Design a protein around this ligand. Structure first.
Ligand SMILES: *[C@@H]1O[C@H](CO)[C@@H](O[C@@H]2O[C@H](CO)[C@@H](O)[C@H](O)[C@H]2NC(C)=O)[C@H](O)[C@H]1NC(C)=O
Ligand SMILES: *[C@@H]1O[C@H](CO)[C@@H](O[C@@H]2O[C@H](CO)[C@@H](O)[C@H](O)[C@H]2NC(C)=O)[C@H](O)[C@H]1NC(C)=O
Ligand SMILES: *[C@@H]1O[C@H](CO)[C@@H](O[C@@H]2O[C@H](CO)[C@@H](O)[C@H](O)[C@H]2NC(C)=O)[C@H](O)[C@H]1NC(C)=O
Ligand SMILES: *[C@@H]1O[C@H](CO)[C@@H](O[C@@H]2O[C@H](CO)[C@@H](O)[C@H](O)[C@H]2NC(C)=O)[C@H](O)[C@H]1NC(C)=O
Ligand SMILES: *[C@@H]1O[C@H](CO)[C@@H](O[C@@H]2O[C@H](CO)[C@@H](O)[C@H](O)[C@H]2NC(C)=O)[C@H](O)[C@H]1NC(C)=O
Ligand SMILES: *[C@@H]1O[C@H](CO)[C@@H](O[C@@H]2O[C@H](CO)[C@@H](O)[C@H](O)[C@H]2NC(C)=O)[C@H](O)[C@H]1NC(C)=O
Ligand SMILES: *[C@@H]1O[C@H](CO)[C@@H](O)[C@H](O)[C@H]1NC(C)=O
Ligand SMILES: [Zn+2]
Lengths: 557, 198
């Protein structure tokens, strides 16, 4: 009865209370998301603050079992997840000041407007209308106007707010023995005391910098090919040995190159695979799509859908007036209630988004036997990786012709192979130097290695050195170009997009071996292979119980 | 003939919670076994003592029908030699069990949109129950070494909690009505058992 038994009993009480409070909160949120009314918002906020206050008071109550006296790893993990002060370690003045600038930055980003230099009554927002100019146009001057004005009219408002946000966040992180915010963020990959699977918070930086050193040989060739293909769409503006101008990359920041596909398709006269026609031709519906997804999943050895999933799920868009947020997600309310919210349309894209979502759900159905605080991916990158490999495998022609959406022969050629691999590389690879660069900047800004009179200087040095793009107009220290990105201004960790890209292929390789695949990797298909399902399940069903370095070893090796 | 009041114990509109479970003893009468298959939604007709070959030819001095309501995935705990909250703090079964247990889903009845907090169960106790024991006390369970003189707080909790049954729950989280028919042959020469075919 010394210290551990009391902790265990307290954890039992918590597991049985929070499980219900969370259900109520999430159910209210779902009902609001699927049927937008006014009172729905009130019920949602009521359930929300109800849950949040309970969590806070439980936190304050749990700060009495000292972590050094616990021996079981499970209860130690739970108590450590529960004990963290997080915010509220600041003063009240300071905490209110922080919560104010967060909302100010988010609102500036969400409702900022720029407008034409000649008809100033034509102001555009970012979302419907600026990143459409940037994504569709081919006029050098129009793209340049948009790229410059967005940063000169909105980026200049975020600078005095970001300079003040850095300080508060650093104080909040130092009050919890972390030395900066960046360490607080990296504190998600940390593992302590398993004797063979440890992981320091500083080791992540070396792992990232070493894994990036082997991609430059391929990113350089891709960059050179794209640069050579752009000197025909914007002649006289691209130097054949210099960088790329930052406004010609496809979107407002350059996070994805996937819009340069039209300009740089290798063999334009070979239309890549699409079955949008053959689906409406065979009269397919949402129900058929999701039945096929469930069939593919049970094919490898994973369970069926819970059959409550078919009734509560909102698969098709409600017609008359049932205003709903169409953004496909999977919901894990709990207690055995998993649902899907998406506004499907018979297409090829939705045929893959169905597999993505059902992958998420199959992940959630696995660790549902864990304590409430240990229901999550092994770290922040596992969930979308597991979701992604499913859509990766369910788009191969070998799978489509087996479904029936293709001609039974459909002889493929080594030209569609390249047309496909390139379209993939513009999304996967084109985004790795950007990510690694951005998160390297923030880590250095929070740490203090960049005095605040040299933020833009370092930003545009690292852009030219790592990513290989150059800005078209100089930027002094009154601008703030990183703050003009969604994740930067809304305080989201950005490294989960780097690691997720790596795991997503490691898995795909290991499973590919269990299915005894022969040819190139990009034609792998794990369907009809039960050993793949078993190797996957033995990692899925863990949750956060084990350190992520063990779950990762359970599959890759 | 006088029949067992099966339909009066197998169709009670409101069942008992598990910790304070209902026990009804059936006295000397005719024991019509193969009539309980009237509705038959069922979930588990397993029997330990008497196997499904002596349904009516064998007799017992008296039988006890225990009735309550639990969650789904806990029906497995209702067995001699099981461990778990229900198997220690709400009901215990002796290893020499001669009757057998019956369960069925009842989601449409005992689940109400908004929560049905009338059913509770004990999750805290100083030691495990005894076979066929029953406890109803609501003393504040003490966890720590500091006596709490009967008030909820640190290291001392109210040893009861309730299922929030709702219709939108998966199986294993839905209400399930359970009935245990325990037999008894002490010394009676003539007692209640099945009818003979005339
Ligand atoms: C979507 O929400 C609205 C408002 O919350 C619902 O409209 C009313 O809901 C109440 C709730 O019981 C009913 O009593 C009213 O009859 C409803 N009025 C109308 C005009 O529908 C609406 O029912 C919700 N959508 C669904 C599918 O339930
Ligand atoms: C403390 O750790 C032990 C093992 O280190 C856990 O024991 C497990 O308990 C579950 C049931 O709760 C069993 O199914 C496992 O087989 C046990 N593992 C072993 C290795 O025996 C124990 O559960 C932990 N404490 C708590 C409160 O869960
Ligand atoms: C969480 O924050 C509190 C302050 O709000 C930290 O300070 C301890 O708080 C407890 C509870 O009031 C006191 O009993 C201790 O004396 C405080 N000082 C200590 C422990 O040095 C607490 O340390 C923080 N905990 C964590 C894990 O960060
Ligand atoms: C696709 O495959 C074909 C056949 O394997 C390739 O065509 C041959 O390419 C080699 C490479 O120099 C030539 O020596 C041969 O003369 C070609 N064959 C014919 C019949 O012309 C083709 O190059 C491949 N293309 C891609 C993009 O992989
Ligand atoms: C997985 O295997 C099953 C059974 O081997 C396949 O189902 C049959 O596949 C053969 C081979 O093309 C067809 O002739 C039959 O018509 C199929 N019958 C049924 C009921 O499916 C299935 O096609 C395989 N799937 C994949 C993706 O390889
Ligand atoms: C269990 O009890 C209920 C309630 O008395 C019975 O439901 C009755 O069913 C009959 C015919 O199905 C109806 O005419 C009555 O109106 C129902 N009663 C009520 C209150 O609605 C049910 O039939 C009983 N089950 C058995 C097996 O006898
Ligand atoms: C899944 O559901 C189908 C019904 O279409 C059934 O035939 C099959 O046995 C089920 N499999 C599992 C594992 O539940
Ligand atoms: Zn996802």
């Amino acid at each position: 009865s010394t210290i551990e038994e009391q902790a265990k009993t307290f954890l039992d009480k918590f597991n049985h209370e929070a499980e219900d409070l969370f259900y109520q909160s999430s159910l209210a949120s779902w009902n609001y998301n699927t049927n937008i009314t006014e009172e729905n918002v009130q019920n949602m906020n009521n359930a929300g603050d109800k849950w949040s206050a309970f969590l806070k008071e439980q936190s304050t109550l749990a700060q009495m079992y000292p972590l050094q006296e616990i021996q079981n790893l499970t209860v130690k993990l739970q108590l450590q997840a529960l004990q963290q002060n997080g915010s509220s370690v600041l003063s009240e003045d300071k905490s209110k000041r922080l919560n104010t600038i967060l909302n100010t930055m988010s609102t500036i980003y969400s409702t900022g407007k720029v407008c034409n230099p000649d008809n100033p009554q034509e102001c555009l927002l970012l979302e419907p209308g600026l990143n459409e100019i940037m994504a569709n146009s081919l006029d050098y001057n129009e793209r340049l106007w948009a790229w410059e004005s967005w940063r000169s009219e909105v980026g200049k408002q975020l600078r005095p707010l970001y300079e003040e946000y850095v300080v508060l966040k650093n104080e909040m992180a130092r009050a919890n023995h972390y030395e900066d915010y960046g360490d607080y963020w990296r504190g998600d990959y940390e593992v302590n005391g398993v004797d063979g699977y440890d992981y320091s918070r500083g080791q992540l930086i070396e792992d990232v910098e070493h894994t990036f050193e082997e991609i430059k040989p391929l990113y350089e060739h891709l960059h050179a090919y794209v640069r050579a293909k752009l000197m025909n769409a914007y002649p006289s503006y691209i130097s054949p040995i210099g960088c790329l101008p930052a406004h010609l990359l496809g979107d407002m920041w350059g996070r994805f190159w996937t819009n340069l596909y039209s300009l740089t398709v290798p063999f334009g006269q070979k239309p890549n695979i699409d079955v949008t026609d053959a689906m409406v031709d065979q009269a397919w519906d949402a129900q058929r799509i999701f039945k096929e997804a469930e069939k593919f999943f049970v094919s490898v050895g994973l369970p069926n859908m819970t059959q409550g999933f078919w009734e509560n799920s909102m698969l098709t868009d409600p017609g008359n007036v049932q205003k709903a947020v169409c953004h496909p997600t999977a919901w894990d309310l709990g207690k055995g209630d998993f649902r899907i919210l998406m506004c499907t349309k018979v297409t090829m894209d939705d045929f893959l988004t169905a597999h993505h979502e059902m992958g998420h759900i199959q992940y959630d159905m696995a660790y549902a036997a864990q304590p409430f605080l240990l229901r999550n991916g092994a770290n922040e990158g596992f969930h979308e990786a597991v979701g992604e490999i499913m859509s990766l495998s369910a788009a191969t022609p070998k799978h489509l012709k087996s479904i029936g959406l293709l001609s039974p022969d459909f002889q493929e050629d080594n030209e569609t192979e390249i047309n496909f691999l390139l379209k993939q590389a513009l999304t996967i690879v084109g985004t790795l130097p950007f990510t690694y660069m951005l998160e390297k900047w923030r880590w250095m800004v929070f740490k203090g290695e960049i005095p605040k009179d040299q933020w833009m200087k370092k930003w545009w040095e690292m852009k030219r050195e790592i990513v290989g793009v150059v800005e078209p107009v100089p930027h002094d220290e009154t601008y703030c170009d990183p703050a003009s990105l969604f994740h930067v201004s809304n305080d989201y960790s950005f490294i989960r997009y780097y690691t997720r890209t790596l795991y997503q292929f490691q898995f795909q390789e290991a499973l590919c071996q269990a299915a005894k695949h022969e040819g190139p990797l990009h034609k792998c298909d794990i369907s009809n292979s039960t050993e793949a399902g078993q190797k996957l399940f033995n990692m899925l069903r863990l949750g956060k119980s084990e350190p992520w370095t063990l779950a990762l070893e359970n599959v890759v090796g | 003939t006088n029949l067992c009041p099966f339909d009066e114990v197998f169709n009670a509109t409101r069942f008992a919670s598990v910790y304070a479970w209902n026990r009804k003893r059936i006295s000397n009468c005719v024991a019509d076994y193969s009539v309980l298959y009237n509705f038959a939604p069922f979930f588990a007709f397993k029997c330990y003592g008497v196997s499904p070959t002596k349904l009516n030819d064998l007799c017992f001095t008296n039988v006890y029908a225990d009735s309550f309501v639990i969650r789904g995935n806990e029906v497995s705990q209702i067995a001699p030699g099981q461990t778990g909250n229900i198997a220690d703090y709400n009901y215990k079964l002796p290893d020499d069990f001669t009757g057998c247990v019956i369960a069925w889903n009842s989601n449409k009845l005992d689940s109400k949109v908004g929560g049905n907090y009338n059913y509770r169960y004990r999750l805290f106790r100083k030691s495990n129950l005894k076979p066929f024991e029953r406890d109803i006390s609501t003393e504040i369970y003490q966890a720590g070494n500091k006596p709490c003189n009967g008030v909820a707080g640190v290291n001392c909790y109210f040893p009861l909690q309730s299922y929030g049954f709702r219709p939108t729950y998966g199986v294993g989280h839905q209400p399930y009505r359970v009935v245990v028919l325990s037999f008894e042959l002490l010394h009676a020469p003539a007692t209640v058992c099945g009818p003979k075919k005339s």
